[PDB]
C-alpha cells in the first residue's frame, strides 16, 4: 500500500520517470476560470438570460443548434490569455522541465497548459480547442481567429458561404475526439506513473484512460474526492491525496524537494505574463 511520500521517492530515485498526467476543470478553477458545472453568479445570470436549462446543454448539439448564445457567452469568457495559470499548471511545467513528462492529457479548453509553457508536443487537448472552428451547416473549417471579433462583440459568428452558425472545435457530447487523442495508444502502455489532478472522471472516453496504464503503474489521484474508475475499480498501487487540489500539489512538491524551484518558476513565469 503506497503513500504520497512513496510516490515522491519513486520519482526522486527515477524509478518513475515517464509520467502521464490527466487533468480536468479542478486545476483551472484556482485561476478564476468559471467551472461550467458550478457557475459563478455573474456567468450564471448571463447564461440564464438565454434560458440555459442546465450546464451540460452548453456542450450539447441539439441545444446549440436551437440556441447558441449560451455557448458563445461562455466562449467570450475563455478568450486566450484572459487568465493566468496557477500552481498546478506550473507544477506540471516543472515536471516537463525536469524531463519527467511523457504526456499531459487535458479536458480543459482554457489553454492554460500552453500558457504555462508546457509544449504542444507534450499536450493532448482531448476535448478540442478554440484554435479552429467549423460551420455547423456546411462543415467548412476556419481558423479560430476568423470568429474572434464576433465572439468578443456578442455576435453569433456566421459562415461566409452559407450563413450557418460557425462553432469552435470544442468537442461536444456525441462528437468525435480529435485524432491526437490516439496518442494514448502508445503513451499509456509506456507510462510508469499516472497522475490524475482535478477531474471528476465522469466524461468518457477520457475517464477510461485511467485503466490504460499497466497494473504495475501507480495511479496518484490529487482531487477533492475518490472518483470514477479509481473509485469503482481500485488497484493495489493506487494513491489518493484527497483534498483541495492546490494543497495536494503543494504537499507533493514539498515531498519531492521542489519547493524553491517552484517558487523560482512561478516568479519567472509571473514576470512573463505581467
Amino acid at each position: 500500500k503506497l503513500s504520497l511520500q512513496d510516490v515522491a521517492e519513486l520519482i526522486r530515485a527515477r524509478a518513475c520517470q515517464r509520467v502521464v498526467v490527466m487533468v480536468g476543470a479542478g486545476i483551472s478553477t484556482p485561476s478564476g476560470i468559471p467551472d461550467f458545472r458550478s457557475p459563478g453568479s455573474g456567468l450564471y445570470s448571463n447564461l440564464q438570460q438565454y434560458d440555459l436549462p442546465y450546464p451540460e446543454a452548453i456542450f450539447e448539439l441539439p441545444f446549440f443548434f436551437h440556441n447558441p448564445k449560451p455557448f458563445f457567452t461562455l466562449a467570450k469568457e475563455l478568450y486566450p490569455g484572459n487568465y493566468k495559470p496557477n500552481v498546478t499548471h506550473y507544477f506540471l511545467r516543472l515536471l516537463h522541465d525536469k524531463g519527467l513528462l511523457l504526456r499531459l492529457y487535458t479536458q480543459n479548453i482554457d489553454g492554460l497548459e500552453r500558457v504555462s509553457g508546457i509544449p504542444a508536443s507534450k499536450l493532448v487537448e482531448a476535448h478540442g480547442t478554440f484554435a479552429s472552428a467549423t460551420c455547423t451547416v456546411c462543415q467548412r473549417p476556419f481558423p479560430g481567429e476568423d470568429i474572434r471579433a464576433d465572439v468578443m462583440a456578442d455576435r453569433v459568428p456566421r459562415c461566409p458561404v452559407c450563413t450557418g452558425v460557425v462553432k469552435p472545435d470544442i468537442v461536444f457530447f456525441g462528437e468525435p475526439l480529435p485524432q491526437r487523442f490516439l496518442l494514448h495508444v502508445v503513451d499509456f502502455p509506456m507510462a510508469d506513473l499516472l497522475l490524475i489532478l482535478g477531474t471528476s472522471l465522469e466524461v468518457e472516453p477520457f475517464a477510461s484512460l485511467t485503466e490504460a496504464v499497466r497494473s504495475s503503474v501507480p495511479r496518484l489521484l490529487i482531487n477533492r474526492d475518490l472518483v470514477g474508475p479509481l473509485a469503482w475499480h481500485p488497484r493495489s498501487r493506487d494513491v489518493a491525496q484527497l483534498g483541495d487540489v492546490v494543497h495536494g500539489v503543494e504537499s507533493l512538491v514539498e515531498l519531492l524537494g521542489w519547493t524553491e524551484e517552484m517558487r523560482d518558476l512561478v516568479q519567472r513565469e509571473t514576470g512573463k505574463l505581467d
Binding site: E56, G174, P176, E202, V203
Partner: peptide
C-alpha cells in the same frame, strides 16, 4: 471514440 457521459 465519441464523447459521452453518465454510463
Amino acid at each position: 471514440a465519441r464523447k459521452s457521459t453518465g454510463g
